[PDB]
Design an enzyme around this catalytic site. Structure first.
Site, PDB file in Angstrom:
ATOM      1  N   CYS A  38       0.976  -1.191  -0.093  1.00 22.35           N
ATOM      2  CA  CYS A  38       0.050  -0.008  -0.030  1.00 22.35           C
ATOM      3  C   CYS A  38       0.730   1.210  -0.043  1.00 22.35           C
ATOM      4  CB  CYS A  38      -0.842  -0.157   1.203  1.00 22.35           C
ATOM      5  SG  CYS A  38      -1.801   1.582   1.528  1.00 22.35           S
TER       6      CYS A  38
ATOM      7  N   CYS B 278      -1.050  12.264  -9.213  1.00 18.66           N
ATOM      8  CA  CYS B 278      -0.738  11.890 -10.632  1.00 18.66           C
ATOM      9  C   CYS B 278      -1.779  12.623 -11.475  1.00 18.66           C
ATOM     10  CB  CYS B 278      -0.720  10.428 -10.872  1.00 18.66           C
ATOM     11  SG  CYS B 278       0.152   9.538  -9.837  1.00 18.66           S
TER      12      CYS B 278
ATOM     13  N   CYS C 258     -11.773 -12.096 -20.661  1.00 23.21           N
ATOM     14  CA  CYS C 258     -12.832 -13.243 -20.604  1.00 23.21           C
ATOM     15  C   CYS C 258     -12.123 -14.711 -20.216  1.00 23.21           C
ATOM     16  CB  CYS C 258     -13.687 -13.704 -21.828  1.00 23.21           C
ATOM     17  SG  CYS C 258     -15.287 -14.398 -21.439  1.00 23.21           S
TER      18      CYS C 258
HETATM   19 ZN   LIG Z   1      -2.863   1.034   3.559  1.00 21.20          ZN
HETATM   20 ZN   LIG Z   2      -0.580   7.694  -9.071  1.00 19.88          ZN
END
Ligand SMILES: [Zn+2]
Ligand SMILES: [Zn+2]
Ligand SMILES: [Zn+2]
Ligand SMILES: [Zn+2]
Ligand SMILES: [Zn+2]
Ligand SMILES: [Zn+2]
Ligand SMILES: [Zn+2]
Ligand SMILES: [Zn+2]
Lengths: 73, 305
Positions: free
Chosen positions: B97, B152, B271
């Site tokens: 993360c 971004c 798919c």
């Molecule tokens: Zn996190």
């Molecule tokens: Zn980003």
């Protein structure tokens, strides 16, 4: 077939039944039919987006119980 | 279990849950549509009238698929549906993360070039902090939204239902602020009377703003635009870690054999419905599971990434 809420910034809620294929203009007519506000003075906003009278509730992916904001012009 | 789809369950779960993809005829709205081909991407199941099929309902002219999602965690009603949250995905690559650096699942992947990944806990924190700081962005087309944490370009969230992760009350707060910001962007003003906060669209001519509206629509206060006090006379005065960001990238961190005849089959987009191009076998199988194609695979992972 779908219940939605129309809410003023003041916090007044108006519960309305709609078809997801209904146009936003039809929503404004239902507001008139129970609050007497002429559609031409109604501005509907969903999640910050001003809604297009010719688009449908399904275009905004609004689900049952969700809130449209009403502002008076 | 492999889950391609995540929904926000507004029902009993009150959270992001793995979801089930379902399909019906767009005309009769019945589960009578036999698809020409299975969906291969998000666009296929999100944009109306993109996929074709034959309706088996007597005398129905429908040839169009309507896809919908249900929460897969709770026993669902027939009529109910949940919004699909396309940015969310099972973290099978074990990406860290961008905020907490931990490996979590599921994760939200931003649509920036870096495809930055953030856990749902940290996404919630991002949303909550930005909402309080009035740091949400008003886009004239996209509404009230946020980009990728790292800022971004071209990363503003388009599917605003992602903000349901705020929780019911905070979502309502998000929507109120969105409408408020929308009003201000339309050249309007908010009534300054405590306990009102009405959205008013006056003209730039009239700086004599009356909170018009009855039965709870307005309060009736007359104010001046500048001071936000009672109508005056004329003119009266009275932080993203660099290394964490680098590691939290979806991408930057072909064929498969038939389970029966081991002859290689190439995938069709995303798919997972595979049909063997070998006349003696021609098995219909799932690219993921390697079992025979079934309704469980359809609901869980009809397509992927
Ligand atoms: Zn996190
Ligand atoms: Zn980003
Ligand atoms: Zn649920
Ligand atoms: Zn049909
Ligand atoms: Zn007021
Ligand atoms: Zn003044
Ligand atoms: Zn085969
Ligand atoms: Zn499978």
């Amino acid at each position: 077939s779908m219940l939605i809420k129309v809410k003023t910034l003041t916090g007044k809620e108006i519960e309305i039944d709609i078809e997801p294929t209904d146009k936003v203009e039809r929503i404004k007519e239902r507001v008139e039919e129970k609050e007497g506000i002429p559609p031409q003075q109604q501005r509907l906003i969903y999640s910050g987006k001003q809604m297009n009278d010719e688009k449908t509730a399904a275009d905004y992916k609004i689900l049952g119980g969700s809130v449209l904001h009403l502002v008076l012009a | 279990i492999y889950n391609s789809f995540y929904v926000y369950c507004k029902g009993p779960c009150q959270r992001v849950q793995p979801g089930k993809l379902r399909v019906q005829c767009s005309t009769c709205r019945q589960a009578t549509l036999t698809l020409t081909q299975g969906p291969s991407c998000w666009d296929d199941v999100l944009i109306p009238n993109r996929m074709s099929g034959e309706c088996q309902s007597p005398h129905c002219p429908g040839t169009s698929a309507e896809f919908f999602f249900k929460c897969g965690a709770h026993p669902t009603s027939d009529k109910e549906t949940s919004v699909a949250l396309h940015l969310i995905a099972t973290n099978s690559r074990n990406i860290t993360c961008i905020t907490c650096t931990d490996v979590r699942s599921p994760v939200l992947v931003f649509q920036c070039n870096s495809r930055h990944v953030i856990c749902l806990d940290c996404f919630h924190l991002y949303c909550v902090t930005r909402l309080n700081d009035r740091q949400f962005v008003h886009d004239p087309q996209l509404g009230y939204s946020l980009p990728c944490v790292a800022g971004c370009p071209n990363s503003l969230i388009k599917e605003l239902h992602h903000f349901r992760i705020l929780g019911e009350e905070q979502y309502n707060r998000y929507q109120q602020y969105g409408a408020e910001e929308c009003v201000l962007q339309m050249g309007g003003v908010l009534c300054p009377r405590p306990g009102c906060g009405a959205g008013l669209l006056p003209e730039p001519d009239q700086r004599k703003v009356t909170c018009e509206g009855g039965n709870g629509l307005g309060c009736g206060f007359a104010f001046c635009r500048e001071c936000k006090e009672a109508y005056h006379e004329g003119e009266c005065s009275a932080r993203v870690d660099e290394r964490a960001a680098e590691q939290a990238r979806w991408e930057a961190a072909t064929t498969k054999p038939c389970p029966r005849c081991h002859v290689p089959v190439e995938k069709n987009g995303g798919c997972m419905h595979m049909k063997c191009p070998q006349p003696q076998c021609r098995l219909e199988w799932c690219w993921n599971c390697g079992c025979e194609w079934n309704r469980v695979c359809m609901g869980d992972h009809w397509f992927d990434v």
